[PDB]
Amino acid sequence: AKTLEELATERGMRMTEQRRVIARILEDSEDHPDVEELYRRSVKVDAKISISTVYRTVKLFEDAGIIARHDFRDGRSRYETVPEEHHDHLIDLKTGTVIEFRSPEIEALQERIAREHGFRLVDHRLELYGVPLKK
Amino acid sequence: KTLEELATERGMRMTEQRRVIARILEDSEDHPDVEELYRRSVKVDAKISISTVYRTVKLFEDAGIIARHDFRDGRSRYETVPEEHHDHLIDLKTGTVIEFRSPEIEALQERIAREHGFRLVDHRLELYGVPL
Ligand SMILES: [Zn+2]
Ligand SMILES: [Zn+2]
Ligand SMILES: [Zn+2]
Ligand SMILES: [Zn+2]
């Protein structure tokens, strides 16, 4: 069973303690943090960590292909550990944070409309943008 | 209100040529790429350059007059801010863009959002296909 720092070294990345920290945070997160939120969380644990380190680390993870970058039109470049299974995204517009979902209801529905117009579905991009409901 | 009139309101400098491109873009309910715009532009006025078509398309986007969609097949496609909301299905083989609106989907999107504690105010749905 592969962890992310374990999965980094596999692709010849120079890890340090600071990067393992940053790797553990990202791994542990299900909200797909941007660079800035990883920083705040990381610095909370290792105060020596710079924004410089976190940006480079992320960009280097991205070159290793061990994370997925997402540019949603919320207001943030969101990052996650490559998902073992596909899912879609819902974005809180108030806080910019991200919620993953797999509705196979929707998957099937998308699968069927491809057909209705004469198509086998090969890919899709599905993004939802919500505001929090009042109570 | 035509496209060019709409552009001249925005304080955009128009010319004969920028007005052809404007009308071509306007009448097109397909989802033309810039090269499509160009090829159609020249047939109507042969002294329209590619430079001119690039500039003009850029400025129509800035003015809010048109929308650009960067689809995953790698072609940027354009439309006139069609007044209807609709989603997209892209034939990867031909670049044919088939538009749709499926109130099943539109409501099942609502449900998903409400179950996670959200009211749905926007989305983006794009489908990618190969003939069956
Ligand atoms: Zn999906
Ligand atoms: Zn995700
Ligand atoms: Zn469209
Ligand atoms: Zn829709």
Side-chain angles (χ1 to χ4, degrees), chain A residues 46-85:
Chain A
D46 188 338
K48 304 209 166 168
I49 294 182
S50 67
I51 187 59
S52 196
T53 304
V54 180
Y55 187 85
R56 290 179 185 175
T57 296
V58 162
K59 290 293 133 191
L60 274 156
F61 287 170
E62 197 173 355
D63 293 355
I66 63 181
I67 59 181
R69 181 193 153 176
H70 281 281
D71 289 343
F72 298 120
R73 301 190 176 284
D74 44 349
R76 272 171 205 186
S77 188
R78 314 296 299 188
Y79 293 89
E80 62 173 317
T81 66
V82 51
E84 297 169 305
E85 53 175 19

